[PDB]
Amino acid sequence: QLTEEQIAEFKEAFSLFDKDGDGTITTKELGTVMRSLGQNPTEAELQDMINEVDADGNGTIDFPEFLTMMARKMKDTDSEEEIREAFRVFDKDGNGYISAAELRHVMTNLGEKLTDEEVDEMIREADIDGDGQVNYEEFVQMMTA
Amino acid sequence: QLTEEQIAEFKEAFSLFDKDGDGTITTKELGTVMRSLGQNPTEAELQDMINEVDADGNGTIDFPEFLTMMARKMKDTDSEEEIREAFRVFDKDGNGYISAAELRHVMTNLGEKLTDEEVDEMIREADIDGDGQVNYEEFVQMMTA
């Protein structure tokens, strides 16, 4: 299962937040780190963050709750990054939009056999705004659907 | 063991490379994927990539050799990204250099207990180009040896 090294990493991460070493992360503490990371959350936003993982309802984050927070955020980050990189793969000219031409080319690269109608269908289904191209937001929706 | 899921992810990745399905990845196949990703490697670069993992000396990459390649690249990418992110956290003004003052204020905020003299020494040691501040390349050197 868990390796000693893994646990060590999670302890180091927890300690970064748990400045006073009391074994809980407060809104105060969470905010301090978030600011170092270049964000500017309000108290209410910080409370919301905690509430998402606050299994015991005590209003602060303990170690197992922090592990849940990390498990979730790691998965989400990974997925988001994968999709973003894929978008960049498709958007060959870097203009922020996937054209039918671009989509056709990439599908061919990837060895997925498509008919003309199929590529069009694919674009049509993801194209919410009717411009006949797929922007990032659209691509994300297509991918999380 | 890897989980069954993990192994599945690696098989998927392998399959993406092994275009012809013969069980080995050639420089042609490698190049194909690289190009599909928007890169443009030379034939020499491709040969080198294979050479680094080609334990049996047949000039192609089999599944266990591919695992080695992936493992290495995944580790490196992960390390690079983490270091780059930390760089960005410390370089508060975004000028591409970490100053002693920047380092000091972040560290303190994040609960470290380094004296001013210790922070100055950190900068001094990492500033191997001698210009007074720590750029990204120096930061990488500091973090990797």
């Binding site: 990054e81 990189e85 894929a86 793969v89 599908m107 997925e112 991918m143 | 990745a13 994927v33 890169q39």
Partner: peptide
């Protein structure tokens, strides 16, 4: 399967850069 392929390429994109 298409979506799988897409995720796969995105993964590789990050590993190989």
């Amino acid at each position: 399967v298409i979506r799988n392929k897409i995720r796969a390429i995105g993964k590789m994109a990050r590993v190989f850069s």
